[PDB]
Amino acid sequence: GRDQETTGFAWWSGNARLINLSGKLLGAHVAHAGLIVFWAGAMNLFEVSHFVPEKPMYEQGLILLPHIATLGYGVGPGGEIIDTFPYFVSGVLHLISSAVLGFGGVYHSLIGPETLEESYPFFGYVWKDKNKMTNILGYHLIMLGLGAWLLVWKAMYFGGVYDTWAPGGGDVRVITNPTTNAAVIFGYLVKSPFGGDGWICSVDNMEDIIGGHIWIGTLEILGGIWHIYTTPWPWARRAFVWSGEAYLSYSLGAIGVMGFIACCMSWFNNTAYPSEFYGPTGPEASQSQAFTFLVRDQRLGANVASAQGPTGLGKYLMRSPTGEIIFGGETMRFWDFRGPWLEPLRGPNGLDLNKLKNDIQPWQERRAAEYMTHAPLGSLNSVGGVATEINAVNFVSPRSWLACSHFCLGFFFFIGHLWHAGRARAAAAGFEKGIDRFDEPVLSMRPL
Amino acid sequence: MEALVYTFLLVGTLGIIFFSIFFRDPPRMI
Amino acid sequence: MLTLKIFVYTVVTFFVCLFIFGFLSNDPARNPGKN
Amino acid sequence: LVDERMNGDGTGRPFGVNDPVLGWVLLGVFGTMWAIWFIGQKDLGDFEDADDGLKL
Amino acid sequence: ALLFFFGHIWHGARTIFRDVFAGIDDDINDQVE
Amino acid sequence: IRAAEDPEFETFYTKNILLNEGIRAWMAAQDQPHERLVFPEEVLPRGNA
Amino acid sequence: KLPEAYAPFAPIVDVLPVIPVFFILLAFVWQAAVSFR
Amino acid sequence: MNIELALTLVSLVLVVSAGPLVVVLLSARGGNL
Amino acid sequence: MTSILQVALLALIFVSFALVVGVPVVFATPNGWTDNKGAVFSGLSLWLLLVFVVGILNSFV
Amino acid sequence: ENSSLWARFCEWITSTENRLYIGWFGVIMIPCLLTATSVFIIAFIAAPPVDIDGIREPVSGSLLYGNNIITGAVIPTSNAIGLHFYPIWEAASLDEWLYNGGPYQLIVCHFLLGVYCYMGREWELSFRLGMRPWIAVAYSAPVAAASAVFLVYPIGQGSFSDGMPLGISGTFNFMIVFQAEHNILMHPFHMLGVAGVFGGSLFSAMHGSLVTSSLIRETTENESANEGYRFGQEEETYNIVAAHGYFGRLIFQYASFNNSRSLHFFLAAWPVIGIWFTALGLSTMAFNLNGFNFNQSVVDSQGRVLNTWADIINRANLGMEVMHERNAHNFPLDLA
Amino acid sequence: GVLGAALLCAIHGATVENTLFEDGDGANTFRAFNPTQAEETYSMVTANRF
Amino acid sequence: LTFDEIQGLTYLQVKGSGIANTCPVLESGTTNLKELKAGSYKLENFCIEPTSFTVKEESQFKGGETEFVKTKLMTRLTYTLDAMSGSFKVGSDGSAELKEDDGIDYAATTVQLPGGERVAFLFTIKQFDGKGTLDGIKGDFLVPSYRGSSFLDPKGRGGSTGYDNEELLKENVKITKALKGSAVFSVAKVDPVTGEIAGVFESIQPSDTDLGAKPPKDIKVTGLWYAQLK
Ligand SMILES: CCCCCCCCCCCCCCCCCC(=O)OC[C@H](CO[C@@H]1O[C@H](CO[C@H]2O[C@H](CO)[C@H](O)[C@H](O)[C@H]2O)[C@H](O)[C@H](O)[C@H]1O)OC(=O)CCCCCCCCCCCCCCCCC
Ligand code: CLA
Ligand code: CLA
Ligand code: CLA
Ligand SMILES: CCCCCCCCCCCCCCCC(=O)OC[C@H](CO[C@@H]1O[C@H](CS(=O)(=O)O)[C@@H](O)[C@H](O)[C@H]1O)OC(=O)CCCCCCCCCCCCCCC
Ligand SMILES: CC1=C(/C=C/C(C)=C/C=C/C(C)=C/C=C/C=C(C)/C=C/C=C(C)/C=C/C2=C(C)CCCC2(C)C)C(C)(C)CCC1
Ligand SMILES: CC1=C(/C=C/C(C)=C/C=C/C(C)=C/C=C/C=C(C)/C=C/C=C(C)/C=C/C2=C(C)CCCC2(C)C)C(C)(C)CCC1
Ligand SMILES: CC1=C(/C=C/C(C)=C/C=C/C(C)=C/C=C/C=C(C)/C=C/C=C(C)/C=C/C2=C(C)CCCC2(C)C)C(C)(C)CCC1
Ligand code: OEX
Ligand SMILES: [Cl-]
Ligand SMILES: [Fe+2]
């Protein structure tokens, strides 16, 4: 440890003492890297320990198992469970491996050399050394580029992943033909984020999700080598701030935006987050209501096309503002929905009247009856209805836990951006301590 | 009738806000 | 309405490019601090 | 076809461009603002140097 | 009446604190414990 | 007056007067138990479904 | 659930998620031990 | 009162005890923390 | 081979509770690492011993 | 001189000698706010009535259509549009734009982009004067709050009709419909924000009283007490030890700040942290994580249910659930 | 009154805190305040011009 | 597009383009009515598509000569009837008829006049049965109530639901009766083989009545239509 009178940093801003201490700081990230793996192993074994494999997975309050189950471990057709031993392995694998990271986090933080500059020259770095930073950048682009390939190799050689758009209920599919067309891949990035377009949440097939990772696997290896052999150009010297805290706040601006995207992708995308495992989306559970309550007129035989509502709009089926046959009611706002239990009921002109009255599979209504009940709107003590719903059931969707947590986690990092990116800009200039009281600028300016 | 009385009092408030910025009493040091 | 959409794109990408090429023009040396 | 319109909200066209005059509007305005910046780079300091940023 | 309650306080506080209405004096640092 | 004679005119103000009717005609059965009043489920205002 | 050779260890595994919260509480304990120097 | 709920709470006592025990054993023996 | 595994796995927690507690005490004592250098290597390797030993007989259970 | 056309231009934007500073956030803040201001005035005065719910019953919001200041609003975008980007050119005629909820989505997109950048130039001027930069952090607490009621809440609901209208009576409907669906008063983030402003007003009434009550005698009694301060002076205008000495007697001595730099941090940190939770409150309530729900919770033996106050607040919410959007719901759940 | 006073608690607490006078050398700027000092702790001139 | 030009498209290839608001145009067919086949043919995929909505407006100007004025459409693309089906009986000299019963035979539509004010209706040709020659299928159809019976005003009034309060016109009259309109067809081109015929129509119906609070108006409709036979 240290003290305040040698560094000017109190007990609460204490981790800022080890900015210029390379070796302690290395132990600080390794120890924290242990806790991420340690949370991954402990929470996985905890959720396996309370897992009833006959009820659906999203009903039991689970968030880490559908991540493993999307990859296709112990799952069968329609979202069923075969065996829960691979869910036990990864919780065991992370938990033992965290102690290996745990020992290195204790070691370098206490006994290992506090500045690994002159002893270990490959590892020693000064924050203004630009060539060394672009090296340490460029090494990790490989380690983060190779990790993209593991998903590609597991989807093309090692059994494949859960493709929820497979016919007759989704199951595990080896994606043989990845869509690698650059015009198809980069069409998502420069697409608008508003409704009907949906910037990157609207990737609808498994053919692209692993198809995209071939790009980001290749680029981060091509880009990783680029920063090893090059230094930043003189416009990048005229643009950025080259301190230690400045590199942090650049990152905090990035992973603030990362949180808002995972906030939205777990709320809208039922392709990377399949509805059999994470539960239905908000738009899926609302569109499940009007479909199941259109089956509840076919048993009585009234005309769903001629069913006029109270406002003269159509009780069951009406027309989109771009002219398509959609559902009606207050669920008209969700007409941009697509789902594998409903897409075999759509023709050119939206969904077909002749097809809906005749060509309903029995399993499609069976899935669209669970999705009426398990709508994601709940409460905070896990009641699970509308706010005017009494203490009867105990359910709130993992989509609602992931969208709320990763909004707030991905929000304060933007406040984390505005803290450090202002402070690093100030302290590089000189006046982070305050006004000089002798030669200050405002006394040397004109009025008004 | 009152629809033009309302819009007088709205742009009347925006009048002072113009005069309170550019024609303010200039603060003089010391 | 196409005549209006080609005008907004001229307006936006004018001001967006004053932004991007404004911060590149040695903004971190536009400070009252001294060294 | 009572009226004529864009028909371009749910299409997902890149950057919202549908007429190729918009791409030249997107690019031609960009190149002009770049051209004025590149000429005026002579006044913004010459950091062709080992390490010459706003360092700390 | 409820407005005159404020008037009773303000003129009640003006009579008791009449000597220091214009701001307090220079040295009042005697009161440190 | 203008909303009385015309079923086409409304504002958020007239949408708020209906919501105040929804608070009065619903919670006052239990809120004021000294008034000993009961309500049929047809006398309280609703929308539909 | 857990495998059957592992099922007598369910009470220990229901503590394991709470452990990383106790690391931030330890850092206030240690700073009280140095008495906030 | 179960045997499962009891041994869980016995398990929580041991870990929570193990936290400050590292601090106590260095505040007495070593003196470098 | 169930009870062979359970005694081996109760043995792991006892060793880990030693290594969670004792190992920061070994580092943060003055000259405690130069003294108990080979001592910790016994405790660390016995942790690495049992984790494969528990790991191998899972195929037999 | 030898300076370029561009360098002449950059030594004017970043010039601090201007009456209002522009900066590089202000070159895209100023044309967005003047856009959003000048369209807000027109739709507050002359907007034709908007179908808000898609059921083709247009809601009036203009002063020229028999409204006053309180009932005036800029009506949100229709339910049929939802989250589709609906600019002015996608509509065939201009009146088709106005009837469908046009100028709501034009304002909010230019407003929110404007106030993200008003936060920007609060940093930028503070770098141009040598100030420490964290005023831009403190302006993020309303910016977090205004981003939620306009953008983060229509995402989780799926439509810009459920966002907040730009009107005084329009706001009051949004407060009522929200608590009917989500029970905001029984959510601890709204409890923090309520303490954020009741604490925030107390910490301004109390701090501002003691500085006035410790002013040094420099003027007469006919002259106002504000004439003792002359602008830009160096010496302190009020006794600080006397105010800590007063407030130390008032409750106890440990309950005060003697360090005035630690005081003014506490005044900044208390409401700003408090508004951050009530900004994240309805951000999490946008994704349907409502609040507490203690309905039918206190029960006795023989299976009977005792009322609490939480069952009384139920009856208020249940009386407003069945009244909002009165001609919309064809089905017995409010999923949208 | 309530929302207006919450705004004056947040600005004045932040305007003072960001216009402080450099009087110490540690970056913990709360340490540099002798409360009996005759001079003020922040710059009312600079805070005006901001 | 033709029929199988539409049918080759997937759902992603059509969503948001307004192609699905259209009726399939036909290129191959007989222009001069060669066929004259008789008997029973299944009137299938009978969808129409309007062009111009003009209203019989009682004029602003005091002169007692009514006219039809051009309008600005306020709904976006909800105006096309689709998937109405039935039987298209044909005779020998040219006598033929059509009877339809199902499908989307009604669609709501508001529209705007100059002067600012608006007017709504639901565009329907439901339960229409016209006879005659292949140039005139002139006949009559019904117009249902625009609002339902359970429709509420801004003040909580209405026939099926609602409380009350000279002003008895505004609550005691909440009508749910159906009026009558007039529809004219014309067959233009016949395909002999694939069984799909097109044509031009002209239809006329009342607008809306505010549940009996203002006298309604009558609207001319032009446009094209389409009908298959198998
Ligand atoms: C549907 C599709 C829609 C598409 C829409 C289009 C979207 C396009 C998105 C592009 C986004 C890129 C934005 C970042 C660019 C960063 C440029 C930069 O940081 O730039 C920094 C560097 C600096 O360059 C250096 O600049 C130096 C300047 O020296 C000068 O200055 C020095 C000191 O300053 C010394 O004084 C010296 O003496 C003096 O000569 C030297 O010249 C160096 O040789 C030189 O390498 O610039 C460079 O390398 C720039 C290299 C890349 C240039 C790219 C140009 C692309 C043009 C496309 C075609 C446009 C057509 C335009 C027509 C116009 C008329 C209609
Ligand atoms: C996960 C978060 C994290 C991490 C990794 C660190 C890491 C570090 N901090 Mg920071 N710190 C943190 C959070 C963190 N801190 C928080 C939250 C606060 C606010 C209270 C501080 C406040 C703070 C101050 C004020 C100071 C540090 C300092 C330090 C460094 C040396 C500490 C020392 O001398 O140990 C000595 C401490 C002990 C001997 C106590 C026991 C600690 C052991 C390691 C706990 C063992 C845990 C676990 C059971 C081990 C498992 C065994 C494993 C082998 C498997 C170290 C790099 C110091 C510094 O600046 O370094 C130069 C310093 O002065 N920290
Ligand atoms: C990648 C993450 C990251 C990293 C590495 C740093 C690193 C640093 N920060 Mg920054 N910071 C971050 C994120 C990060 N920050 C975020 C998100 C915020 C916004 C809240 C800030 C705001 C911030 C401030 C305001 C300050 C720093 C400071 C510092 C320095 C020392 C930190 C310290 O001693 O804290 C020790 C840790 C504590 C005292 C613990 C207190 C935290 C309490 C317990 C709140 C947590 C409550 C609860 C867990 C929240 C649950 C989550 C819920 C919201 C969903 C160091 C350079 C300080 C500095 O000197 O600046 C250079 C400083 O003054 N940071
Ligand atoms: C997350 C990892 C990471 C990080 C932190 C950096 C960081 C950096 N890079 Mg590196 N880089 C990376 C990944 C990364 N890069 C990868 C993966 C590649 C391979 C493509 C590169 C290739 C690369 C080159 C070639 C160069 C850098 C440079 C730089 C430096 C300045 C960048 C800058 O000014 O951005 C500011 C951002 C901009 C100016 C705008 C960038 C926006 C781009 C163009 C995205 C638009 C693409 C669009 C979607 C395509 C449209 C398709 C449409 C037509 C259909 C900075 C140190 C520069 C440098 O200093 O040289 C060493 C430099 O010359 N990088
Ligand atoms: C969006 C707009 C919408 C419509 C706007 C309607 C506004 C209505 C409210 C106006 C409020 C006026 C309050 C008092 C202003 C004031 O005291 O200025 C004081 C300044 C002092 O400036 C002084 O000027 C001096 C120079 S000199 O001596 O004057 O040459 C200089 O020495 C000194 O420093 C400087 O302070 O006086 C002037 O220089 C300008 C004259 C201002 C008086 C005329 C204002 C009324 C006319 C407004 C326009 C017509 C509106 C119709 C109704 C009247
Ligand atoms: C630097 C520092 C710090 C930090 C530290 C840390 C953070 C550490 C970490 C550490 C870690 C991170 C650790 C970890 C560990 C782990 C372990 C040790 C594990 C173990 C495991 C086991 C033992 C298992 C078991 C089992 C199995 C095998 C399976 C199932 C069943 C059971 C559970 C039995 C602080 C903040 C205090 C501050 C001061 C200094
Ligand atoms: C796998 C995947 C995919 C793909 C993805 C990708 C391919 C991505 C990429 C991405 C990218 C490629 C991105 C990029 C980005 C960029 C950015 C984000 C930029 C930024 C910029 C900046 C930040 C700048 C700034 C500045 C300015 C403004 C001025 C001056 C100063 C400075 C320089 C600072 C897909 C979708 C297919 C599917 C799903 C998954
Ligand atoms: C994996 C595993 C393990 C390990 C574990 C661990 C690693 C643990 C750790 C733990 C820990 C490491 C804990 C800690 C704790 C601590 C605590 C719990 C504390 C608390 C405290 C408090 C709560 C208080 C605070 C304070 C102070 C002192 C001053 C300031 C203020 C206040 C009052 C706040 C073993 C081997 C067992 C086996 C099983 C499995
Ligand atoms: O939009 Mn304004 O508030 Ca969301 O729930 Mn359904 O939709 Mn409407 O009702 Mn309830
Ligand atoms: Cl509905
Ligand atoms: Fe103050």
* Gap between the Cα atoms of L184 and L169, Å rounded: 35
- Residues with Cβ < 8 Å from H9, sequence gap 6 or more? none
Tokens 């490019």 locate to: C17
Task: Please report the sign of the dihedral spanned by the C-alpha atoms of residue J90, residue J79, residue A191, residue A160.
Answer: negative
* Gap between the Cα atoms of L4 and A188, Å rounded: 30
Of C1, C13, C21, the CB nearest to D26: C13
Please give the full DSSP string across J141-159, using - where no structure is assigned: HHHHHHHIIIIIHHHHHTS
Q: Could you say which DSSP state residue H28 is in? A: I
Amino acid at the residue J224: S
* Gap between the Cα atoms of C3 and L24, Å rounded: 31
The response to whether residue G25 sits with its C-beta less than 6 Å from ligand 8 reads yes
Q: Locate the ligand 2 atom nearest the alpha carbon of residue A24 and give its number.
A: 57
Q: Could you say which DSSP state residue A442 is in? A: G
Interface test with chain B among A440, A443, A448, by most B beta carbons within 10 Å: A448
Q: How far apart are the first and last CA of chain I?
A: 6
Q: Among all ligands shown, which has an atom nearest to the Cα of B20?
A: 5
> Contact G15/H15, CB-based, under 8 Å?
yes
Q: Is the pair D, I in contact (3+ CB pairs within 8 Å)?
A: no
Closest-CA residue of L relative to A308 is L148
Amino acid at the residue L183: A
Rg, chain J, Cα only: 26
What would you measure as the largest C-alpha separation in chain E, in angstroms?
41
* Gap between the Cα atoms of A324 and A318, Å rounded: 8
F40 touches chain L (CB under 8 A): no
For C1-35, letters b (16+ CB in 10 Å) and e give: beeebbeebeeebbeebbbebbeebbbbebbbbee
* Gap between the Cα atoms of A349 and L6, Å rounded: 9
Give me H20's structure tokens. Answer: 């400050």
C-alpha distance from G5 to closest chain I C-alpha (Å): 6
C-beta atoms surrounding L172 within 10 Å: 11
* Gap between the Cα atoms of H8 and H27, Å rounded: 30
Residues of J with Cβ-Cβ distance to K39 under 8 angstroms: 234-236
**Which phi and psi angles does E26 have, rounded to 5°?**
-70, -65
**Which phi and psi angles does L52 have, rounded to 5°?**
-135, 125
> Ligand 7: which of C17, C19, C23, C26 to mutate, most ligand atoms within 8 Å of CB?
C23
* Gap between the Cα atoms of A261 and A58, Å rounded: 21
**Which phi and psi angles does A207 have, rounded to 5°?**
-70, -25
Q: Is J310 annotated as a binding residue?
A: no
* Gap between the Cα atoms of A292 and A331, Å rounded: 13
Q: How many CB pairs under 8 A join B and J?
A: 20
CA of A383 to the centre of ligand 10 (A): 23
Query: Looking at chain A, which residues constitute the CATH 1.10.10.670 domain(s)?
Result: 280-375
> Contact A4/K28, CB-based, under 8 Å?
yes
For residue J101, what are the CA distances in angstroms to A198, A426, J48, J169, J286? 21, 45, 10, 18, 21
* Gap between the Cα atoms of L69 and A330, Å rounded: 34
Q: Which long-range contacts (CB under 8 A, 24 or more apart) does H6-11 make?
A: H7/G11, H8/G11, H8/G12, H8/G14, H8/G15, H10/G11, H11/G11, H11/G12, H11/G14, H11/G15
Q: How far apart are the first and last CA of chain B?
A: 52
For L25-49, letters b (16+ CB in 10 Å) and e give: ebeebeeeeeeeeeeebebbbbbbb
* Gap between the Cα atoms of J135 and K10, Å rounded: 9
Residues of L with Cβ-Cβ distance to A325 under 8 angstroms: 20, 82, 104
C-alpha distance from A277 to closest chain G C-alpha (Å): 17
A10 touches chain I (CB under 8 A): no
Residues of B with Cβ-Cβ distance to J232 under 8 angstroms: 29-30
Give me E24's structure tokens. Answer: 């307090």
Q: How far apart are the first and last CA of chain K?
A: 25
Considering only CA atoms, which residue is closest to atom 31 of ligand 4? Answer: A236
Number of residues written out for chain G: 37
Give me A359's structure tokens. Answer: 């060509």
Asked if CATH classification 1.10.10.670 holds for the domain at A280-375, the reply, yes or no, is: yes
Is the CB of residue I12 less than 8 Å from the CB of residue I46? no
Q: Among all ligands shown, which has an atom nearest to the Cα of D34?
A: 1
**Which phi and psi angles does J287 have, rounded to 5°?**
-95, 30
Chain G residues 11-30 with a CB less than 8 Å from chain I: 12
**Which phi and psi angles does A327 have, rounded to 5°?**
-80, 175
C-beta atoms surrounding A233 within 10 Å: 11
> Contact J91/D5, CB-based, under 8 Å?
yes
> Contact A191/D12, CB-based, under 8 Å?
yes
I16 touches chain A (CB under 8 A): yes
* Gap between the Cα atoms of C19 and L210, Å rounded: 54
Of B3, B21, B29, the CB nearest to J63: B3
Q: How far apart are the first and last CA of chain J?
A: 64
Closest-CA residue of H relative to I30 is H30
Q: Locate the ligand 6 atom nearest the alpha carbon of residue G12 and give its number.
A: 33
What is the architecture of the domain spanning I1-61?
Answer: Orthogonal Bundle (1.10)
Q: Helices (H) and strands (E) in chain B — how many of each?
A: 1, 0
**What is the residue extent of each domain of chain D?**
1-56
**What is the residue extent of each domain of chain J?**
1-336
C-alpha distance from J257 to closest chain L C-alpha (Å): 57
Indicate which technique resolved this structure. cryo-EM
Amino acid at the residue L28: S
Neighbors of chain I by Cβ distance (3+ pairs < 8 Å): A, G, H
* Gap between the Cα atoms of A134 and A230, Å rounded: 8
The response to whether residue H18 sits with its C-beta less than 6 Å from ligand 8 reads yes
* Gap between the Cα atoms of C17 and D37, Å rounded: 10
What is the three-class DSSP state of K21?
strand
Q: Is J264 annotated as a binding residue?
A: yes
* Gap between the Cα atoms of J334 and F49, Å rounded: 9
For residue J92, what are the CA distances in angstroms to D8, J96, L74, L114? 12, 7, 9, 16
Give me B1's structure tokens. Answer: 């009738």
